[PDB]
Design a protein around this ligand. Structure first.
Ligand SMILES: NC(=O)c1ccc[n+]([C@@H]2O[C@H](COP(=O)([O-])OP(=O)(O)OC[C@H]3O[C@@H](n4cnc5c(N)ncnc54)[C@H](O)[C@@H]3O)[C@@H](O)[C@H]2O)c1
Ligand SMILES: NC(=O)c1ccc[n+]([C@@H]2O[C@H](COP(=O)([O-])OP(=O)(O)OC[C@H]3O[C@@H](n4cnc5c(N)ncnc54)[C@H](O)[C@@H]3O)[C@@H](O)[C@H]2O)c1
Ligand SMILES: NC(=O)c1ccc[n+]([C@@H]2O[C@H](COP(=O)([O-])OP(=O)(O)OC[C@H]3O[C@@H](n4cnc5c(N)ncnc54)[C@H](O)[C@@H]3O)[C@@H](O)[C@H]2O)c1
Ligand SMILES: NC(=O)c1ccc[n+]([C@@H]2O[C@H](COP(=O)([O-])OP(=O)(O)OC[C@H]3O[C@@H](n4cnc5c(N)ncnc54)[C@H](O)[C@@H]3O)[C@@H](O)[C@H]2O)c1
Ligand SMILES: N#Cc1cc(Br)ccc1Oc1ccc(Cl)cc1O
Ligand SMILES: N#Cc1cc(Br)ccc1Oc1ccc(Cl)cc1O
Ligand SMILES: N#Cc1cc(Br)ccc1Oc1ccc(Cl)cc1O
Ligand SMILES: N#Cc1cc(Br)ccc1Oc1ccc(Cl)cc1O
Lengths: 249, 249, 238, 238
């Protein structure tokens, strides 16, 4: 398929409901060789078990809060893939107290710091650590949300972090393009994943396609953006939300 | 390939340099069945000859200035494709006097009217005329340019028309989504085509990928947007300009 | 006030509810000298009454569908204001059939053409017609709506026409900036529980922002679409 | 003037070239009563001199890296202004190493953290700390730059920090709108042949727009990033 001969690292697989899971089955269907990271020991077996289904045995600890963990992870990966063709960054976090109710009351300095570090900085932190391993033609991809561009109740400081993240996409694109690397985001519509219970009160009637997008839709667009078919696209946030953001009333 | 079982009409093939030409070879490579329109008798043989290469014999006159021409064209097409899966709208025009020098001096009421009618209205005019022929899963695609969003010297009233066109993309998406049709645009970076001699003084050093996009890049993104792989994307303007618009200085 | 010294042409007064009417009051308050146009004989008396109440007797016919009507108006204005400081374009139209139901079914070639001509081309037409009359420091203003940027039901082809108008703003700001003329738009909210300010905007609110954008206070702003919609467009799922 | 009746806190004066300094002059001209903060002992005398020249003697230490410094400042302000009408946030910082060369190579976790904390979090921190002190009709303003929206060389992580700040504006406008508080930003140009107005913006131009956005004239505007950059961001390849 259209990713044959590519090697792609995939972060953030937590269950079969994860966006990262849909992106992985899609790139896998399309002929990519895959490798996987997992945040910590609680998810090691699970992620090894999801990896195994997709015929990868490359499954590595990576907590993106830690420079040493990202560095170690890429060192270990370089033993099997001294070069590869990019990564999918599918990782968000803010402490639970940040997303309950009025934004200005819930936000704290520490909550802001963690949300931005894990949801935004980690993307460029991964890029720094593997920059010399990337082939020409490589593509990096992260996931964002409409909360970057609009004030969405309860999403709160995550909206700020995703705005920081989309700006990260542009700065990374502009920096890395000259060495042959593209960097994009998918602004995904809402899907019912493990991380979405963290959000309070979690629209298909006012989406133009009249249904919510699935991890399959998101996965297919992802595969496209990490392939040579999208060689003309970098620094872009592609809305995969069924047209929701372009509608009003 | 990823358009097998799709039938797609392609307008605006004028030479081998046309964006429509790149989109057609790409959809053709990907297993689509194709049909072609041509503006008038001056391009009939040429377009039949380009069609023939791509193994289509469906080649029909269509001047989009004329409701009767669009209606006749779809009547003729319905004899061979009573149903199909969408069309590529790759058609722009403004009289030559519109694009020389200062915008407020060059623009006229008639120039404005023609630019908008041919470059913007024609897209929804085609949609009106074939609406009942479209399958569920159909996708419509037009081509726009950065001149819709920024004041670009000499591009002049075409910038207004392309802004009208991108708004057309949203209104069409929102209207047709409920019956299972998606509608998008590609905002293409500059390529050296037949229509670009019309533009005066026609940047790769400040594009992040450090080269201009080709009709191949544009064609591959096009194919994607008219395929089921992009089923989560409607009402969107995708920038295929190598990241040019997201850079400054 | 912050417009003393300025002479501003105001189009589009049709009633005391008109956006142009709120704009004119606010501009008069801030000390501008005002002149007015009226589309046709049906509105002439209303515009003359309102102009009198503001201390103006410059009240000129202008139908922006006609190049000759625009030229004749500016030749008449020239007799009393050979130079002036810009104008407010507060004009919109599409045939009523364009606004009824599903967009693709309602839009027609003629409806599209009329909507773009009246709602967008007429802004630059006015600018061509008065260009040598503009002082350095001039400011042109037009009025737009969120339907330029989102698909809003029934607003239909008026949305394309507004998107065209917002591009016209940019192209005009770019062309006329070197001669000392700024061009901007207000994207006004409709004149409520999901609006951040928790109320709809009024023609007073619109008027005050329009006065600003036509004054030397806004000298740093050109080519800009300013949202005066209470925060509505930046909120989602409130 | 159009700010008479208003009491506005101004942060970020460091010199007569500071954006905050142009803002304060313009606000004083339009009749506002002013109060000032200063980051540290190095800037205290400059801020006191300037405040004296404007007829103010409210000059309070505030380092926005510290929650305690922000709380203590607002407790001191409360002794003379138990209620007030909003504040201008004119504060930006990243370690100098963040701004040197290729973005990906210069950015570090600590640099990123400091840039976002000082340049974005501190806007809402101030708002939490004074929220019950704000009158209905209040207006918060912050300052941003085009590097929030485009990749500009060397501006590097300050661009992410500004994008965060512009989202903070929206989220804040949404949260505080129901209590009668507006929140906006100015995206200022750098303080020229491809700028539509054919000159860079001045701190006077910025000041006048900031005075507007903090006055009841802008009552219809909230959650908005207004570009005061002479049209620069809407032009291409001039
Ligand atoms: N599900 C939706 O509706 C939706 C919509 C738009 C965007 N997104 C985004 O898509 C991405 C994937 O989210 P999801 O819904 O698939 O959720 P998920 O809960 O399946 O995935 C979140 C993942 O991030 C990982 N992660 C968190 N902290 C980490 C750390 N310190 N180190 C390493 N990994 C860490 C978790 O272990 C988990 O694998 C996120 O960026 C989320 O914001 C989700
Ligand atoms: N080439 C570029 O750099 C570039 C960049 C961005 C967008 N675009 C857009 O892409 C599209 C294709 O342009 P191109 O550069 O491939 O040019 P081209 O000159 O090869 O194609 C323009 C086509 O439009 C057709 N057309 C014009 N008037 C017509 C009418 N009345 N009826 C039917 N067809 C009509 C012409 O016959 C021709 O086939 C246009 O919308 C153009 O604005 C071009
Ligand atoms: N009312 C709202 O909620 C709202 C919101 C956003 C934008 N707008 C825009 O504000 C502007 C003013 O609208 P309004 O609500 O004040 O409506 P209104 O009907 O009071 O004013 C419309 C005006 O346009 C004039 N006009 C129409 N065709 C014309 C022609 N051929 N020549 C000259 N004048 C012509 C009419 O005479 C009338 O004065 C319009 O551009 C409208 O699109 C309205
Ligand atoms: N100067 C320009 O061309 C330009 C253009 C666009 C935006 N901006 C923005 O305008 C704002 C003001 O910048 P400026 O050009 O006036 O610079 P300036 O250096 O005069 O002002 C920066 C101010 O930030 C203050 N500051 C830094 N860290 C702080 C802390 N911990 N606590 C409290 N105060 C702190 C400094 O004391 C200083 O007063 C900034 O947000 C800057 O990003 C500047
Ligand atoms: N990853 C992740 C995640 C963590 C927190 Br805490 C909050 C939301 C998260 O993902 C989302 C889930 C759902 C939506 Cl709509 C957006 C998201 O960014
Ligand atoms: N199609 C077409 C076309 C017609 C005119 Br007249 C002007 C430009 C045209 O296409 C473009 C060529 C080049 C660029 Cl960069 C943009 C365009 O829209
Ligand atoms: N003027 C005007 C106008 C004409 C038509 Br037909 C449709 C709408 C018009 O004005 C508006 C009224 C209300 C809103 Cl919300 C937006 C508008 O553009
Ligand atoms: N304040 C401030 C500031 C601090 C750093 Br470090 C970098 C830039 C800063 O201000 C600016 C100066 C100039 C411009 Cl163009 C934009 C700015 O944000």
């Amino acid at each position: 398929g259209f990713l044959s001969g590519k090697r792609i690292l995939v972060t953030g697989v937590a269950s079969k409901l994860s966006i990262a899971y849909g992106i992985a089955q899609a790139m896998h269907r399309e002929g990519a060789e895959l490798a996987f990271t997992y945040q910590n020991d609680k998810l090691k077996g699970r992620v090894e078990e999801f990896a195994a289904q997709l015929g990868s045995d490359i499954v590595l600890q990576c907590d993106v809060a830690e420079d040493a963990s990202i560095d170690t992870m890429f060192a270990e990966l370089g033993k099997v893939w001294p070069k590869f063709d990019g990564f999918v960054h599918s990782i968000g976090f803010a402490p639970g107290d940040q997303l309950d109710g009025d934004y200005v009351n819930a936000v704290t300095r520490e909550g802001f710091k963690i949300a931005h570090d894990i949801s935004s900085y980690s993307f460029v932190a991964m890029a720094k650590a593997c920059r010399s391993m990337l082939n020409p033609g490589s593509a990096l991809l992260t996931l964002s949300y409409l909360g970057a561009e609009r004030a969405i109740p309860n999403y709160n400081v995550m909206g700020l972090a995703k705005a920081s993240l989309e700006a990260n996409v542009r700065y990374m694109a502009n920096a890395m393009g000259p060495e042959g690397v593209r960097v994009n985001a998918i602004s995904a519509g809402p899907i019912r994943t493990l991380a979405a219970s963290g959000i309070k009160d979690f629209c298909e009637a006012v989406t133009p396609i009249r249904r919510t997008v699935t991890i399959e839709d998101v996965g297919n667009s992802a595969a496209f953006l990490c392939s040579d078919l999208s060689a003309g696209i970098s620094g872009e946030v592609v809305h995969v939300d069924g047209g929701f953001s372009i509608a009003a009333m």
